[PDB]
Structures are given as structure tokens and as C-alpha cells.
Design a protein around this ligand. Sequence first.
Ligand SMILES: *[C@@H]1O[C@H](CO)[C@@H](O)[C@H](O)[C@H]1NC(C)=O
Lengths: 115, 121, 107, 107, 192, 119, 105
Amino acid sequence: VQLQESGPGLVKPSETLSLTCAVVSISSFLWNWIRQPPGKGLEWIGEINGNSGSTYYNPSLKSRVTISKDASKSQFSLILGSVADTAVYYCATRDSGPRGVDDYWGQGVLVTVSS
Amino acid sequence: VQLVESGGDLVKPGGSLRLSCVASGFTFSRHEMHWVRQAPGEGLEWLSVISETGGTTYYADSVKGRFTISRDNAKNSVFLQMNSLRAEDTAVYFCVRDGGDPAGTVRFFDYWGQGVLVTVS
Amino acid sequence: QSVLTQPPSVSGAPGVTISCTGSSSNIEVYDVHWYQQLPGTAPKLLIYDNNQRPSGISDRFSGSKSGTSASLAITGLQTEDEADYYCQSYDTSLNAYIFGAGTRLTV
Amino acid sequence: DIQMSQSPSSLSASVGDRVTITCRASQGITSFLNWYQKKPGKAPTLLIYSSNRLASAVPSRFSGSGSGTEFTLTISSLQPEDFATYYCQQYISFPLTFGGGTKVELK
Amino acid sequence: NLCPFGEVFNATRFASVYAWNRKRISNCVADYSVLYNSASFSTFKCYGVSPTKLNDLTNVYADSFVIRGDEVRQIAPGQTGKIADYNYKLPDDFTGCVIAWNSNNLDSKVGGNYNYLYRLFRKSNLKPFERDISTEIYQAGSTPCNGVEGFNCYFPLQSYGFQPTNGVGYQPYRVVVLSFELLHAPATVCGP
Amino acid sequence: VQLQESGPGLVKPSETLSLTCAVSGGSISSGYGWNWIRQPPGKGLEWVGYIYGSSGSTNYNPSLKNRVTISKDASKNQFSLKVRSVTATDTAIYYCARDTYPSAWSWGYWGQGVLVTVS
Amino acid sequence: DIVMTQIPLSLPVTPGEPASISCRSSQHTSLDWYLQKPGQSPQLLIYMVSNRASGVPDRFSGSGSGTDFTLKISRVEAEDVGVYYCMQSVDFPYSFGQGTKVEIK
Ligand SMILES: *[C@@H]1O[C@H](CO)[C@@H](O)[C@H](O)[C@H]1NC(C)=O
């Protein structure tokens, strides 16, 4: 089932970066955020666990980053602080099971900061 | 893409004969290559099949036990080692290339061979 | 579905049919195995592989598994068979060994 | 197996008409049928697959249809290079069974 | 005085390859050239014992699992692959035979038939004659996943998905593996 | 053959209970499939674990989430059961077992059992 | 971290000829292959070292042991346009590839 994302759209050059990913249960899958600057490759920024067990972050960006998710609101969000920037944002996962590998991703939304 | 048969001869009933359809123009180890025959004055009739690794086969009712289909993926050729050739096995023997992934719901014959004539008399 | 189901309790006189019916995932693919547990004791292997009795057994005990339903016949019970009777198949849905709910024999 | 039976025996009319050809069946083959095109003296050629979808490099003249047991090939606009025999082929079950062949001829 | 070969060779529905049946066959007088004279089996090859002269010379088991057609290469002593390493590994000193026949009219349906599974990933290879029925999530190299799956963590089972019109290499072959095992014990199954 | 359990029978919740089934008459390093099966005192049996003798690959019951673990100490010929973060519903009578014949689907050859309750 | 590099930065391929994308990392192994058709999200097509995804066509094939892996496009029909990425998941810092824009001729 598809994942839709939402954010502010415009952001100051010294503000914070925050956006959500409305989504199947949170407790089923391990969830993930990746991004894409213009003219550059994809960048993994961090990943959370499904039962809220732990969080893992990209160590270059692991200075003011925070991923939190709800357990009932079907919510999943990112909090990057002190904003590499000016990119489009994806929330993603990889389903599995008997009938192959599904790998649902989201559409994306562009957040334009000063770099 | 081209498929060239071999092994045309005349058969006294009971001898041993072997065909060889060398295939070319495509990657060979990814399709099921097999044999369809046609007696003169008669319509076409399916004969055999063999998998993409020479792992398994399935014959028709009339030819089960007498024939043997084989392949060598390095030599890019499919064979038909024939035994107990009855009188009614006087036909043209085509070699066919099912086109489609081996795993798909689509089975169709893409490129035929020209067919060699073998007479049983 | 996906669970074996015995009757609650069976009883009789000297002179008892215990059935463990299962679903499409439980049996018709696998084998039913009967255990008997004396009250306050370890259970005992009674019927395995739907009818094969182990070394040391009575003869009035016999399993008959046909299709998606098994049965344990006790014709003419003795007064020393008052115990529990469970059934063990294997499930594919939840993918674990399924024991039955439970039944007991009373003379 | 499933015995495919074409109808009619042969067909002939003026060049440019809309000719038709069918391939009935005995047991159900749920919309699989392939049509092959054989000219006398050469190898046969694939015409359409899965009873609707046209093949590689086949021009858009011929089109097929059909569902279940009754199938139909439509010779829409007859070109003069098409007087030949056509074979229908099912693949829902081994052994594969071709049609008897319907011979079309230019007038 | 006979064996239940009408329940092993003619069951209505076999099991998957990762969770394979095994029925101990004892108290028999068995005729092994009943199936060998039938010859409706695409594979019938007796390793170690002499085939068709084995109706004369402790107990035998009977495995039951249906795989795809080109996977019958693994059901042999000394094979590798997705069956002989992770699902069913025959030992190096096997004594018996594998019987496989193309059961395509039975075990596949229109659309998919997603009942028969296999185990794509597993942390190590099987010791010979060992099952594994666990469905814990398989991590690949680093990240621990507490019952969850995503990147780097996969569901271990995966279906076959038998279409009625796949190729001949991808079709349900019902494989029955008889393991003849004589021990220092009085025999209960011999030939007549 | 012979199989005798051990272990403490009273525990405080959210701890790890350890139960060793000491066996005799046959070596654990074999093709045999060794087992744990628990029973609450009212309801009835329910399978909890499994371990293959030679390799030592462990297979559990997925209704129990990730709590159980089974290790087989081969020098003393015994195997354990450690369900962690226990609760008041994991208070049962535990029976170690061994399958009937190699790679069977059932088991004779039980033990006497213990009764571990959790206050 | 663990970083990789594709050997072609961009690739011209005529319709019909086979293609080849290689990938050379720093140090059953997780390495992925994606497709960014222009203006959409990426899509999985090779999920471990040699496997195939759910709705991928039969043309692609993952391969390669060690470090040098290869996703071989067998018959490049006129819709395989975009870039191709390598995800190494053997450690915590997940790293995508650089991308390789394929070119039709
Ligand atoms: C299995 O079924 C076939 C078909 O009815 C029968 O001929 C055969 O005797 C049966 N038993 C065995 C052991 O093959």
C-alpha cells in the first residue's frame, strides 16, 4: 500500500527540517528515509525500527537528525536540524513474503534550503 | 536467428538415427528447444520438449520410450536419438524455439527450423 | 480453520471413539499423532503415523486417519484407561506443531 | 488431451474481403490459443500469440479474438501474399495439440 | 503384510520441500518392482542398492515433497543449490531411490498456486536428513531486526507460484525419496 | 531413553528461567530431534521448542515472539530452555522429549517434568 | 563507510543489443539494482546478488560474486531509460550508487 509524504515546502537558511510520511502497521516493517539532491545520487539519511526498538542514522548527517514514528497514528517522520540540503525527500520500505518482494516507496516532496 | 537441422537419411525399420539442430542468433541456455513433426498429407503433431538446462523432458504418447531428446548448452545444439523407428515415422522433423521466459504464463513458438526429411522404409 | 478440535469429554462402560478433526492446513497433508496422559503423569506415545503403535501397547487402541479427520477407537475400555487424550498434527498457516484442545475418558 | 478442431476445411474468396477462421475445442483452455502461418514448402511462422496479441514483424492485417472454448481468427483485409494454411495451438496442458490446418486460397 | 504405498505414492496432496513428510515403513513384505514395472515416473534411480534386483535383498522411510521440475537435479547424493543445501540434503552414503513424476494436472491452478513454498535464505547448510521449519526473519549481515523486515531483513520463505502453463523446467514434480536402512536388528520389511 | 529435567521452580517476572533436561542412554550428537513442550495446569499442551541433535539448529514456536532460546550442552549431554522476559501466563509444566524415529513428526521418550511458576 | 563505483558513468546502447552495468565496491550478499525512469520514484529489480523482484521482466539478470557485480540487460527494448544504482546493506551506512544514464541510439 502506497506511502504519501508531506512537508512545509519552504524553509529558512538556518531553520530546521521536518516532514512526515503517512502510510499497514508501523510494527510490521523496518522503515527508512532517503533523499536526492538535484544532479546527485540518492542518499540514505537514516532508518527507524518497526516496534520502535532502535534508530540508525547516516553518520555524516548524524549531527542534528531525528526520526520518530507513532504507533497508532500511522505516522513516520524526520527531524533534521541546522540546515548538504535543498533536495527531494522519500520515505521507503521493502515488503517481503511468499509472493516475492514488493518494495513500496513514496512519491516525494522537494525541500529547498540553502546548502 | 537461425536453426539448422541435420541427420537426413532413409530408415530401414529398426535402425538407429540421430538428428542435430544447431541453433544460432540468440542466447541458447534460456529457452526450451524442441521438436514438431508433420507426415506428408497429415497435419502437424507435437513430439517432445526439453528444459533450458537439459534437466527434464516430456514426450507425447506415441513416441514415449522410443525417442530421447538431448542438448549441450556449450555446443548450442539439440538432438533426437531415435530408436525403434516404425513405418509411420516418415515425416519432416522441425526444431522449434519456444519464445517466452521459461517462467511465464506465455508459451509460443518463435522461430522454427526449416525441417529435415526422414523416410522410414 | 488452522486448529484441531476434539470433543470436551468422552465416557463409557467396559464393553469410546475420540475424533480429532483438522482443517486443510492441519492435515490431509500431514500425520495425526495421539498421546495419552495419565492424571499427574507424563504423556505417553499412543498412536503415531496415523495407525502405527509403538513398542508396548494395548490392542484395543487404533488410529484411523482418513482425509481431514482422524479418530481413535477404544472399543470395550478397561478401568485403567481413565486419562487424557490429545492429538498432534502440524500446521502450515501458523507453522508450528498443533496439539488438540483436549479430552478425557471416564468409566 | 484437448483435441483442437478447426472449421471449415478450406476457404476461398476474392482478394480484399474479410475472411474468417475458427478453432473450437473440447475441454477448456482459458484464452491461450496461438495461431501459426504455414506456406507450402517453407517452415511455418508465428502469427499471433495468446489469441489477441500480435507477434514480432507481423503486419496489422490479421487480428484474433476468442475466449474459453470458441476461438476465432479474422482475416480482415486480404493481401495477395497470404494464400496458405493456418494452424491453431493450445498450451494449457501437455501434450501440445495443433489444429488440423485450414487452407485459404486466392479465389 | 504389505506396505502403505497407496498412501505415499498416491496421496491427494504433498507437502512443501522445506517441511517434508517422512513415514517410517515397517512390518512389511514389499514388492519394489510394482512401481518399477509401472514406469510412469520420469525419474527412478536407485543409488547403492541394485535397482530391480532389490526385490530380494531393517526399515525404510518415505519422504514426500513437491518441487519444481528442474530442481530434481539436487535430489541426489552430493548436490548443491536451493534444495540440496537449504531444503533437503541427501547424505553421502545414501541407499535408496528418488521417484519423481510430472504432476502438472494436479498441483497447479489457474492464476497462481501459492501453497508450496521453499526456503530461499538460511544461515548455514543442512546436515543430512534435517528439517528447518522456522520463520524468523533472516538478517543478511549487520542490522538486527526484531521480527520486522525491510532492507537487510527478508522473510525466509518464498512461494513457487505454479501457473498451469509454465515451462517444463518450472512445474510441480512430486518427489518421493525412499531410504533403505539396514541395522543390527531383526528385519520387519523384506521382499517376497 | 532416559531424560531427567532440572531447574528452579519459582521466579519473579521479567527474568530468565533455566531448565536442563539431562539425558542418558543415548548421545545428544545425533540425527534425533530434541524438544521442549509446556502445559499450563488447566488448559493443555502447547509446543514451545525444538533442536536438532547433530548440527544444533534451533526452531521455535512463532506464537512466542522472540523470547525463547534453546542451547544443547554436549559435554554433559543435556539441553536447556531460556524463555526471557516471562509473564504470569508462562507458568506451566515443562516436558523435554525426543522424537520417535529420526526426523519424525511426533515423540515418545519424555521426561518426568518440572513445574515452574512465576510470582 | 563502504563506497562503490559503477564503471560506466553513462552508456549508449542501440535497440536490440545487450547492455552491461558493472559495480565495484570498496570492501547471499545484499546488493541492489534500481531504475529511475525520469520523474518517478526508484523501483527494485535485483534484490540480492542474483534474484529478481516481483514485477520485473525476464530480461534483467543479476550476477557476480566477490565485489564486482553486474546487472546485464539482455535485450534493451525502447523503454529502459534512466539510471542504475548499487545499494550495499552489509553494514549500517547504506550507500546508493552513482548512477548510469542509459542512452538509446
Ligand atoms: C497409485 O495409483 C495408480 C493409479 O490408480 C495405481 O495404478 C497404483 O497401483 C497406485 N499405487 C502405487 C503404489 O503406485
